[PDB]
Design a protein around this ligand. Sequence first.
Ligand SMILES: *[B@@]1(C2=[C][C]=C([C]([C][N]C([N])=[N])OC(=O)C3=[C][C]=[C]N=[C]3)[C]=[C]2)O[C][C]([C][O])O1
Length: 237
Amino acid sequence: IVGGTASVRGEWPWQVTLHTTSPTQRHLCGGSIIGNQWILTAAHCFYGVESPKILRVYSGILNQAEIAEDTSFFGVQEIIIHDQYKMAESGYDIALLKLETTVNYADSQRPISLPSKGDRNVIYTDCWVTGWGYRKLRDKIQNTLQKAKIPLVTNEECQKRYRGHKITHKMICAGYREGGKDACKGDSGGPLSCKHNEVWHLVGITSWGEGCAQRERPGVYTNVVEYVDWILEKTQA
Ligand SMILES: *[B@@]1(C2=[C][C]=C([C]([C][N]C([N])=[N])OC(=O)C3=[C][C]=[C]N=[C]3)[C]=[C]2)O[C][C]([C][O])O1
């Protein structure tokens, strides 16, 4: 997260830090708890991941320093990638992680409500992107969970900033026309949370962008509401 600040413990209880143990353990991507056994994240996070066995999900985490060899974690039983996904910039950058065990909710770890199709007309004015990603470019994973408030931008306006891409209705962008605040490497898969009527919604999933926090280069996120049907179908035993 570029241009953000340190988060408060338990402030983003749905945020998880997804790690890979190969070759040696490290943060790989962000993710959001959406069910007692489900994490919603980005599909491009699993490039090269041949098996869910090397994945480890950590919830109720603020600082990466909290994570040690003796720290409890959730194993991944199954990785579910949307069957139409090819690459982040093409859309369909969404994936589900079925945990080997159930998450016991608490103030430090609880789910985030998915957006309702009857909210597409709703205009979010209080959205934040969070993560342990780079603060600058060519940097490194941060210790403390960073947060940054970022206004959404219309797709028509986003399309203007990405003339070489096709910004579909399954994508949603956010950023300041002057840059400065934005998601960056390591923030992938994390949530874009908007607070509407005292309730938090998982509006988007950090997917891609051009560089980090550049002027006239809004971050691009998966438009979660466009996938509630997909999510139901895939999480229904
Ligand atoms: B992801 C991941 C997250 C962010 C980025 C960013 C784009 N973000 C944005 N502007 N909203 O791009 C870079 O940081 C970047 C791009 C090109 C050259 N240098 C840096 C990219 C990727 O987080 C984990 C990673 C795993 O695949 O994906």
